[PDB]
Amino acid sequence: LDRIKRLKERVLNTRPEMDLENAVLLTRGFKESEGQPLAIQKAYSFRKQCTEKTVKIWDDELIVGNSGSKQRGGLLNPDTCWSVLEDEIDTISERKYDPFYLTDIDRKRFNEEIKPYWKGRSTFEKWLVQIPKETKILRDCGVLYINRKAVRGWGETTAGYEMVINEGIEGIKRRIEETKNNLDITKSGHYEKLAYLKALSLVAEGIIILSKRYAKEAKRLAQLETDSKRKKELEIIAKTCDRVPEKPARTFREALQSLYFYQICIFMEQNAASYNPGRMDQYLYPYYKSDIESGRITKDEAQELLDCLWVKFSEPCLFQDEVTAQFSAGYPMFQNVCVGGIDERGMDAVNDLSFMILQATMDVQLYQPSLSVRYNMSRNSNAFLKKVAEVMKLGTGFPAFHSDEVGIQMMLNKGIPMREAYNWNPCGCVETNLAGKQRCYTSYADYNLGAIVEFVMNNGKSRKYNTQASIATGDPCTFETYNEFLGAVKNQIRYVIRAMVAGSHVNDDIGFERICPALSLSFKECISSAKDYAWGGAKYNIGNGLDAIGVADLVNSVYAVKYLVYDKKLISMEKLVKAISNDFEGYEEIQKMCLDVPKYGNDDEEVNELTADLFTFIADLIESFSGKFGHMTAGILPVSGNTPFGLEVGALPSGRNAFVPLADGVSPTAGTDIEGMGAIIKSVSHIPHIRFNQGTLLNLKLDPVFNQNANSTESLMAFLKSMCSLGVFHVQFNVIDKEVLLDAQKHPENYKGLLIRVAGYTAYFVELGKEVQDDIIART
């Protein structure tokens, strides 16, 4: 009860503004270490950053740090995406989606030493000039969205946090000296491996530096402190910050500062989405246990710490251009923390600490510990399960729920063995990865299945921009049979993904040379290889993944043609084309028999079957292709692109008006699930989950009049078990009066800190663009 430090309303009354500080340090680091090998002049100016960076502790903190200079700041990395800002230099402040304030004077810095150095030298700039011909058109004609991962650094991986807590930069330096001593600059390949290893030495040094300046500030705050209490907490914030990364953790306090200290450095250098701290309930437990039975911490002192950490997680803002924001509104960092599941010996893995990590989200209720669960029905206690469901019906959006039994073989289906794959941890939205051991763009680019449907009915040409976007599959009125049809729908899938594999292959080669680290500092192999995450170095290198969006709309559109055209012969294609071309202006009798046909989600065998055929094909299709890091992977997750992808697709044989959102993930189109919620699951069980080893996403919008009877809890639980027992991968819930959302678009102000599940993550309703707000509204 007495943890009344919600005095971190500081974070809600804060405004997003660019933070071009670090961008200036980096500029200076580069200029003085020119001629160095790029990993050395990157890592030498990282030390510069944390040596000459703001250092600030805010008025009530027990855990400290911040990747920038401001709270809710937008971090520019000019080495990767400088020109994003030079473009929107005088709009970004007032843009509709995800805006940032660019102060009067930060903008002097930008075109005075940031812009005149970096002009023509960035990752993103190389991507704009090299994206392949066919890929580039499809991107333009609205068919897929590749530019996101050329502005946002690596991300989408859970780093080697457990080592930094357990060895500290002290013990990692030994690993560095071990493999440096085994090399010989006389010997063929060794200079590159020795030179990189130096960069790993600067960055270890830079973290050290930073963490001690932090304690230093905490002594300064002490020796001016009136409050007996808040003085004696400052002194322990220094006693910690002095040990923390340099040496191994020894207390609960000292683990959480190890962790988050490292967390912000990795986000310092690149700013990517989805740096997931991972199985936090598993490697912190030994510290929690021994501190309980010693007095150094009491359970309530624990959950205070956590609730602070959770407010620090809610602190930064993911930086993106004008448009990628539309495709992922809400500043989301996607920092996945997960509890529960299975042990290295196959036994339940859930301790007191799994519940208190669920607990701190019921308490703080900010958006940025992306909570998650690995529920192992045959291992995790019903007691665990209850606490999960109680969380959910806070309408919080949290936590996303994964069926542990599915997530394991997804990781086996990736080539990892059960000896290490039990540790899989949700990553970002719903992706999979593995702590310290997997490089992998778990979601390189999205592809618009709505556009495709619109392509086969239009024989390649784009309705809206009137160009020959895709290949010419022939016009739809010479398909004698249904298979002639399906044939052309596959051919159209095949043309798009090719282009994506080109683009992936191109940006792999850009990330290679030019986008190095010291995140890699926490991958054991990267150290003994003398080889970076970007280059190889990771234990298991996995091909990039390609997320599809428009599931509901493929199935419904294709089956609508099998029904009405090829064996119920009610409409000739001739006329269908006419109907959708015109948005059903005159033709609004057709739009009717379409939304009469079985829909994906009500669970009609004829549909579930086609749903299986298509996507086993889409899987075989991708695993065909290989880059330098293994064969490609796929998933189904939209983030928020289902809405703006919707705006480029015409009307479709599914009964969908033109320019509406596309479906979201593997959920149905809004207004087609007139059967149950238990038949929502069953229609989606036929999606082959373990073939899409990078994740699957389900959205469901519960009405809040449910938390009433004293079984809503007992009954939500049992439904979670249906999901798992059917072999479905993931489900997550909203629990909200429409009444509230509707008012909040009216008066955005008296609804601060109100949450919603968008897809994979959680945003503040008021801070999203109106389009996506409707999309979320219209869900049943």
Ligand X SMILES: CN1C[C@@H](O)C[C@H]1C(=O)O
Binding region for ligand X (CB under 6 A): 148, 152, 156, 273-274, 328, 334, 428-429, 431, 443, 639
- Tell me if residue 429 is catalytic: yes
Q: Which of 429, 440, 516, 724 is catalytic?
A: 429
Closest separation in Å from C-beta 326 to ligand X = 11
Report the residue number, 429 or 662, with the smaller CB distance to ligand X.
429
Q: Which of 17, 167, 431, 648 is catalytic?
A: 431
329/323 Cα distance (integer angstroms): 10
Report the alpha-carbon angle 765-770-776, nearest 5: 60
Report the residue number, 256 or 542, with the smaller CB distance to ligand X.
542
Residues 6+ away with beta carbon under 8 Å from 512: 534, 535, 628
Closest separation in Å from C-beta 115 to ligand X = 26
DSSP lists the bridge partners of residue 336 as: 370
Residue 330 — left, alpha, or beta (φ > 0 → left; ψ -120 to 50 → alpha)?
A: left
Closest separation in Å from C-beta 332 to ligand X = 7
* Residues 699, 664 contacting (CB under 8 angstroms): yes
Report the residue number, 275 or 600, with the smaller CB distance to ligand X.
275
376/424 Cα distance (integer angstroms): 13
* Residues 652, 453 contacting (CB under 8 angstroms): yes
Closest separation in Å from C-beta 761 to ligand X = 8
Closest separation in Å from C-beta 502 to ligand X = 20
Secondary structure of residue 215 in the 3-state scheme = helix
383 membership: H or E segment, kind and range: helix 382-391
Closest separation in Å from C-beta 693 to ligand X = 15
Report the residue number, 276 or 380, with the smaller CB distance to ligand X.
276
Report the residue number, 156 or 281, with the smaller CB distance to ligand X.
156
Closest separation in Å from C-beta 154 to ligand X = 11
- Tell me if residue 431 is catalytic: yes
672/594 Cα distance (integer angstroms): 11
Report the alpha-carbon angle 493-497-501, nearest 5: 165
460/458 Cα distance (integer angstroms): 6
Q: Which CA distances in Å does 229 have to 215, 222, 239, 281, 291?
A: 17, 10, 15, 29, 21
649/387 Cα distance (integer angstroms): 42
Closest separation in Å from C-beta 205 to ligand X = 31
* Residues 527, 176 contacting (CB under 8 angstroms): yes
Query: What single letter denotes the amino acid at residue 149?
Result: K
669/756 Cα distance (integer angstroms): 19
614/452 Cα distance (integer angstroms): 13
Report the residue number, 273 or 389, with the smaller CB distance to ligand X.
273
666/555 Cα distance (integer angstroms): 11
Identify the residue whose tokens are 């238990």.
678
Report the residue number, 106 or 321, with the smaller CB distance to ligand X.
321
Report the residue number, 443 or 699, with the smaller CB distance to ligand X.
443
Closest residue to ligand X using C-beta atoms: 428
Closest separation in Å from C-beta 159 to ligand X = 15
Neighbours of 88 (CB within 10 A): 17
Closest C-alpha among 71, 87, 72, 67 to residue 23: 67
Neighbours of 538 (CB within 10 A): 24
Report the residue number, 147 or 413, with the smaller CB distance to ligand X.
147
654/661 Cα distance (integer angstroms): 13
DSSP β-ladder status, 755-757 and 762-764:
antiparallel
Which residues are catalytic, by number? 429, 431
